[PDB]
Design a protein around this ligand. Sequence first.
Ligand SMILES: Nc1ncnc2c1ncn2[C@@H]1O[C@H](COP(=O)(O)OP(=O)(O)O)[C@@H](O)[C@H]1O
Ligand SMILES: [Mg+2]
Length: 303
Amino acid sequence: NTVMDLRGNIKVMCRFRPLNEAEILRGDKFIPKFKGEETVVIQGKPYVFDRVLPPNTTQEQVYNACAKQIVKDVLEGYNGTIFAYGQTSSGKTHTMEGKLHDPQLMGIIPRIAHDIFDHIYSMDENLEFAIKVSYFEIYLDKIRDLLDVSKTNLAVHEDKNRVPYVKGCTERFVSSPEEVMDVIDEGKSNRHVAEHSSRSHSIFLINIKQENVETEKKLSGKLYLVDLAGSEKVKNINKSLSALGNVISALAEGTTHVPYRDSKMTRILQDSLGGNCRTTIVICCSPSVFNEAETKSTLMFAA
Ligand SMILES: Nc1ncnc2c1ncn2[C@@H]1O[C@H](COP(=O)(O)OP(=O)(O)O)[C@@H](O)[C@H]1O
Ligand SMILES: [Mg+2]
């Protein structure tokens, strides 16, 4: 959807982060200019987005602009993806997970958590839910499961009925917002070390299933939260982000065939990416000169 027009439904948003302690000491010039709620400029000719989020924008502000709508109709049987993009340091991980237990500094995923268990708990009623989550990285084109260090190079089969999935990826049923937090921690705790996260894609899946206890009828929704690896140029390739780009721009033209198979990632996410779905990309940029290099690359990744 009652708040989603058209097969996609790709929105691109642009969070600029504040200059940090280093950058201010150094005396970094500050390059971006903000015309309105959607436009940003550097040197010349604009970039237009669904939304621009200047340094001042709070997490709670970011959540409402990017996630809250997606959350509502996952609870109504639809699939959704939220991407965080940008060079290393831009604030992708600030945006997606934040400080998990500060009520003010926590990012999207914890906020999605609290949100979910609040629609659910203002009602049931006759609705009984099963919420399971999967947490896995894609490093060097292999699918490492962050919930089970046994599993690396996991395999992408295509289901029964046409569309891809990830065989035998650990699932972990949760039932409180903090149990959702736990799974993020568990994975951070299984996650390889030696920057490593700076060079691998994090996929966080929240699978909500619900059944009516009388009518018996049931809905299923999937919400993927993805923390993409830095887009900079200066642990390899990252043709991946190009496959991603290829998919998005394709959807947003109204051709007919979409380069899903071009990467493991766009293969997996295919059923939560395009058509009936919502996909919001949060591209994250630094306002410094010292990163204007990538800032502009990052900026035109979208269209
Ligand atoms: N919008 C913001 N407001 C305040 N601090 C931020 C913001 N964005 C990033 N930071 C801080 O700057 C650093 C870089 O963020 P990070 O999420 O690690 O970027 P990336 O994930 O792209 O490497 C972190 O210490 C983070 O907490
Ligand atoms: Mg990061």
